[PDB]
Each structure stands twice: as structure tokens, then as C-alpha cells.
């Protein structure tokens, strides 16, 4: 049945605004950071963390969190990938390691109801005037 704590992007932004211990962790690929940009959560009062997840780097990825979060066992790490990718797996990963809890933002940041498609604020990079429809 359900395993990885997940739901809707809006729920995560709401929880991040009432959970003083909540934080957003971008598991996206560095290439996405130049295209889509990065989240904008500071309006509440937190700071994002960027760490490219990879199954080959599970341990090497994990350390980077433990070394930034004072109390991982009390900090909530809301996942953020382009889409599903590994959001639920990584939500259990940190939990099993010792972190408090995590939330896999179903649909990622670019999905049909992702971060952007949820009316949430975001920090896009330097866009250029260039259409792409038809």
C-alpha cells in the first residue's frame, strides 16, 4: 500500500509555512537549475538545499544533508525532482537513515500539477524572448 509520504505540492508549501522544522531539498539535476531555476520559499522563512540524488551516490548524497542540518532527526525534508523520479524512495531513505520525515511532492516541479502548476512562487533563471508554440 502507500509507503512514501506524499500528496500535493500545495500541501507541502502549506506545511513548510507551519512546520518551523521543515525545509525543501532539490534532488533535481543541476541542468534543471539553469533551465527551470530554483524554488522561492523564503517568503515563509526557510532556505532550499540543492543536492543531485543518484542511486550510485546514496551514501555520498546523504552526508551532504547531515552536514548542513543540525538535527536531521527533527528536520522535515520535502523532496523536489523534475517529476516522480526517486521522490518516494528518497523520502524513505532519509527516514531510514534517521531524519524525522519527508514528503515526496507528487508530479515533481514540472508535472501537470507540479510546483509551478500549483500557483506556488518560484525563482526562474534569466529567460530570453523565444516562443515555442504553434
Largest CA distance in the chain: 50
- Report the phi/psi class of residue 24: left, alpha or beta, with left for phi > 0 and alpha for psi in -120 to 50: beta
State how far the alpha carbon of 114 is from the alpha carbons of 46, 111, 134, in Å. 20, 5, 24
- Exp. method: NMR
What does the block give as the cell for 55?
542511486
CA dihedral sign of residues 45, 49, 50, 53: negative
134: three-class secondary structure by DSSP: coil
Give the other-Cβ count within 10 Å of 110's Cβ: 16
Q: Could you name the CATH architecture of 1-134? A: 3-Layer(aba) Sandwich (3.40)
Say which residues have a Cβ less than 8 Å from residue 118's Cβ, sequence separation at least 6: 8, 9, 10, 13
Amino acid at each position: 500500500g502507500s509507503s512514501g509520504s506524499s500528496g500535493s505540492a500545495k500541501n507541502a508549501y502549506t506545511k513548510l509555512g507551519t512546520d518551523d522544522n521543515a525545509q525543501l531539498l532539490d534532488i533535481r539535476a543541476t541542468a534543471d537549475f539553469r533551465q527551470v531555476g530554483s524554488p522561492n520559499i523564503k517568503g515563509l522563512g526557510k532556505k532550499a538545499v540543492s543536492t543531485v540524488y543518484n542511486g550510485e551516490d546514496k551514501p555520498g548524497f546523504l552526508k551532504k544533508l547531515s552536514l548542513k542540518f543540525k538535527d536531521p532527526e527533527n528536520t522535515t525534508l520535502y523532496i523536489l525532482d523534475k517529476f516522480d523520479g526517486n521522490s518516494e524512495l528518497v523520502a524513505e531513505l532519509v527516514a531510514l537513515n534517521g531524519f524525522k520525515s519527508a514528503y515526496a511532492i507528487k508530479d515533481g516541479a514540472e508535472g501537470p500539477r507540479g510546483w509551478l502548476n500549483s500557483s506556488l512562487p518560484w525563482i526562474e533563471p534569466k529567460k530570453t524572448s523565444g516562443p515555442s508554440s504553434g
